[PDB]
Design an enzyme around this catalytic site. Sequence first.
Site, PDB file in Angstrom:
ATOM      1  CG  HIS A 147      -0.538   0.434   2.455  1.00  0.00           C
ATOM      2  ND1 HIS A 147      -0.313  -0.430   3.501  1.00  0.00           N
ATOM      3  CD2 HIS A 147      -0.184   1.664   2.903  1.00  0.00           C
ATOM      4  CE1 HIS A 147       0.138   0.244   4.537  1.00  0.00           C
ATOM      5  NE2 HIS A 147       0.223   1.517   4.202  1.00  0.00           N
ATOM      6  CB  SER A 200       2.637   1.927   6.435  1.00  0.00           C
ATOM      7  OG  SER A 200       1.391   2.266   7.045  1.00  0.00           O
ATOM      8  N   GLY A 201       4.777  -0.542   6.593  1.00  0.00           N
ATOM      9  CA  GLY A 201       5.830  -1.256   5.932  1.00  0.00           C
ATOM     10  C   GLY A 201       6.972  -1.742   6.787  1.00  0.00           C
ATOM     11  N   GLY A 229       2.480   6.272   9.547  1.00  0.00           N
ATOM     12  CA  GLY A 229       3.863   6.469   9.072  1.00  0.00           C
ATOM     13  C   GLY A 229       4.849   5.325   9.322  1.00  0.00           C
ATOM     14  CG  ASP A 265      -0.383  -3.727   2.850  1.00  0.00           C
ATOM     15  OD1 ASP A 265       0.215  -3.294   1.832  1.00  0.00           O
ATOM     16  OD2 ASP A 265      -0.649  -3.001   3.857  1.00  0.00           O
TER      17      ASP A 265
HETATM   18  N1  LIG Z   1      -1.182  -0.579  13.658  1.00  0.00           N
HETATM   19  C1  LIG Z   1      -2.023   0.430  13.216  1.00  0.00           C
HETATM   20  N2  LIG Z   1      -2.962   0.880  14.032  1.00  0.00           N
HETATM   21  C2  LIG Z   1      -3.797   1.843  13.655  1.00  0.00           C
HETATM   22  C3  LIG Z   1      -3.725   2.429  12.426  1.00  0.00           C
HETATM   23  C4  LIG Z   1      -2.747   2.021  11.504  1.00  0.00           C
HETATM   24  C5  LIG Z   1      -2.656   2.595  10.222  1.00  0.00           C
HETATM   25  C6  LIG Z   1      -1.679   2.148   9.354  1.00  0.00           C
HETATM   26  N3  LIG Z   1      -1.502   2.668   8.049  1.00  0.00           N
HETATM   27  C7  LIG Z   1      -2.474   2.854   7.117  1.00  0.00           C
HETATM   28  O1  LIG Z   1      -3.639   2.565   7.372  1.00  0.00           O
HETATM   29  N4  LIG Z   1      -2.145   3.356   5.886  1.00  0.00           N
HETATM   30  C8  LIG Z   1      -3.185   3.576   4.867  1.00  0.00           C
HETATM   31  C9  LIG Z   1      -3.652   2.311   4.151  1.00  0.00           C
HETATM   32  C10 LIG Z   1      -4.272   2.430   2.906  1.00  0.00           C
HETATM   33  C11 LIG Z   1      -4.698   1.308   2.211  1.00  0.00           C
HETATM   34  C12 LIG Z   1      -4.499   0.049   2.767  1.00  0.00           C
HETATM   35  C13 LIG Z   1      -3.884  -0.084   4.001  1.00  0.00           C
HETATM   36  C14 LIG Z   1      -3.465   1.048   4.702  1.00  0.00           C
HETATM   37  C15 LIG Z   1      -0.809   1.128   9.782  1.00  0.00           C
HETATM   38  C16 LIG Z   1      -0.907   0.552  11.015  1.00  0.00           C
HETATM   39  C17 LIG Z   1      -1.885   0.988  11.912  1.00  0.00           C
END
Ligand SMILES: Nc1nccc2cc(NC(=O)NCc3ccccc3)ccc12
Lengths: 250, 56
Positions: free
Chosen positions: A41, A188-189, A186, A90
Amino acid sequence: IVGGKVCPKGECPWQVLLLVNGAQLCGGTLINTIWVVSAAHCFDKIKNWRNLIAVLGEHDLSEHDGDEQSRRVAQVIIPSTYVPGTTNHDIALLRLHQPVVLTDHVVPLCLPERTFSERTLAFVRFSLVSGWGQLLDRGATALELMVLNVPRLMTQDCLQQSRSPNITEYMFCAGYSDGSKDSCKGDSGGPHATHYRGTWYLTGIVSWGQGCATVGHFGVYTRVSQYIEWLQKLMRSEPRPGVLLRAPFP
Amino acid sequence: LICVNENGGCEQYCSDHTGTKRSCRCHEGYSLLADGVSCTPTVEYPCGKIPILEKR
Ligand SMILES: Nc1nccc2cc(NC(=O)NCc3ccccc3)ccc12
Ligand SMILES: [Ca+2]
Ligand SMILES: [Cl-]
Ligand SMILES: [Cl-]
């Protein structure tokens, strides 16, 4: 990362910072000298594929201390089953243009065998998640790499304890439902890393959740054990022209 | 021994074989000791180890 601490410099040596035109994009995990694992993503909105940079040995984004190593990303490989803008499958495998040099500050995380990961690692309760993401919901991102210990849930218990998209067999939950501690957008990944008998292994990828540290919800992570064979096959393959590659999954 | 119980006694990876047989294996950058279960680094920077802590 919400409710964690600063990872002491050199103690998260597999952590990767991904940049697009100098700007923070995502995290990732070094798994050998030329391969990084991140989230699919992270690449949904990339404009110029040729300005993606991976940085290893990073710690404090405010300074240069000479332990950093930057490489261009030559290939971004995503499973065919990933659909942009959704949550399932993902995962991305990134090939660096030139190997990083292993040092005290740059070391890969072990990509485990599937059987080992499923039969043994999946039952280690606590694992470490890291990144330079938001320190609070609706808050500023971290200038120093942060780390958090989070417990894993069986998906049945995750669904029972939550109060969304489905949690699929390609995902798992970890963290806390009281809103105190989570990975965040932030991050992510980045790695979900699991210790077993003196060695750390890649078990998850920071993927998605509801806001960050939202009461009643857990973090959702890509279940890397489902992709070991797919990754291993790609790492033996020759590079192909063009940065983005969609590869069949399974 | 069987790999699904206690990891077959292996430190790292475990294969079941035909019989009451089991083989432990190690990731690249490690070798298996004569005990048949333990893995020791063969390179300076093996995966999954943190040098500043291994040094102490
Ligand atoms: N551990 C966590 N707790 C709460 C919220 C979070 C949000 C995260 N990041 C995103 O959601 N990015 C956008 C996205 C868009 C399309 C598909 C997937 C994610 C990552 C990890 C999280
Ligand atoms: Ca720095
Ligand atoms: Cl291209
Ligand atoms: Cl087996």
